[PDB]
Design a protein around this ligand. Structure first.
Ligand SMILES: CN1CCc2nc(C(=O)N[C@@H]3C[C@@H](C(=O)N(C)C)CC[C@@H]3NC(=O)c3cc4cc(Cl)ccc4[nH]3)sc2C1
Ligand SMILES: [Ca+2]
Ligand SMILES: [Ca+2]
Lengths: 233, 54
């Protein structure tokens, strides 16, 4: 996250962190339930073996609430393609259930039509993660969050060097210096509605971070709600 | 002119659907629709979508 603020205690409890063999975070996820993490398909190629950390807000310290879960099954969308990052979505089933507690709790899955008509027409959503704090920078040791405007789909297509499929949407700022960034990928984009947070996106890609005339590109969760349902059985 | 689910989400806490010419509310998994047919009440601890307060 470039800009924004730290997640304070209890604020981003649906955040998961995918960690490689060196215990270092390379991607984000969203807690969907005690057994299932939502993340991006492209994140699966970033490490041969990986686990999921939840409850973490500061990677430099053991504040007690943290827990690592092994992955049992990886359910990657069969139409994912590296070239366009279309269908950039995966669900992970954990070997052991997550225990909800302070800083550890699921985001809600919305219903498609309502979400599209009511959540994705709100002014902003919220993206969070431990990713880079500027394009060239290092990853953040603190969990951050950032309010990001939904972006008009035509502006987004005109802004972009690469194809924006209907499985994607855009969010963030034209020139203001706040955006998600590398390492946030796979993490949550949720939309608040009356103090309840619904998952609306998965951090997917951007052309660098916070570049002028460029936006964050997210997987469109509402295109995949049946698919997530199925994957979770 | 905004009617039903387009007028303030139909007064629903969460999901609003229009059936016939009337608002029907519902709720994410882990919530129960209240007796007024509009509010959503959590059925247990750590309901989805709530920031944790303890
Ligand atoms: C069709 N393509 C899909 C993948 C892609 N990645 C691209 C890229 O520039 N990536 C960076 C260099 C890339 C790289 O190092 N290369 C050698 C290509 C590695 C990932 C980088 N990603 C990000 O910096 C990133 C991810 C992200 C997510 C969101 Cl929501 C907002 C901002 C944002 N910024 S451009 C592109 C176009
Ligand atoms: Ca920690
Ligand atoms: Ca920008």
């Amino acid at each position: 996250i470039v800009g924004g603020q730290e997640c304070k205690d209890g604020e981003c409890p649906w955040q998961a962190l995918l960690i490689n063999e060196e215990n270092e975070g390379f991607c984000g996820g969203t807690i969907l339930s005690e057994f299932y993490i939502l993340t991006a398909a492209h994140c699966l190629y970033q490490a041969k073996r990986f686990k999921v950390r939840v409850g973490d807000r500061n990677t430099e310290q053991e504040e007690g609430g943290e827990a690592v879960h092994e992955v049992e099954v990886v359910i990657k969308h069969n139409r994912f393609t590296k070239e366009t990052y279309d269908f950039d979505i995966a669900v992970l089933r954990l070997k052991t259930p997550i225990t909800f507690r302070m800083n550890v709790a699921p985001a809600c899955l919305p219903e498609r039509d309502w979400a599209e008509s009511t959540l994705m027409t709100q002014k902003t959503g919220i993206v969070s993660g431990f990713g880079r704090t500027h394009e060239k920078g290092r990853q953040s040791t603190r969990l951050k969050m950032l309010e990001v405007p939904y972006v008009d789909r035509n502006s987004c297509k005109l802004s972009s060097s690469f194809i924006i499929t209907q499985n994607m949407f855009c969010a963030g700022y034209d020139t203001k210096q706040e955006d998600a960034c590398q390492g946030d990928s796979g993490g949550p984009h949720v939309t608040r509605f009356k103090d309840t947070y619904f998952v609306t996106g998965i951090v997917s890609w951007g052309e660098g971070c916070a570049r002028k005339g460029k936006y964050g590109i997210y997987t469109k969760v509402t295109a995949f709600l049946k698919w997530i349902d199925r994957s979770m059985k | 002119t905004r009617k039903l689910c387009s007028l303030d989400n139909g007064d629903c806490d969460q999901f609003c659907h229009e059936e016939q010419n009337s608002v029907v509310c519902s709720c994410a998994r882990g919530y129960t629709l209240a007796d007024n047919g509009k509010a959503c009440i959590p059925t247990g601890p750590y309901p989805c979508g709530k920031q944790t307060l303890e």
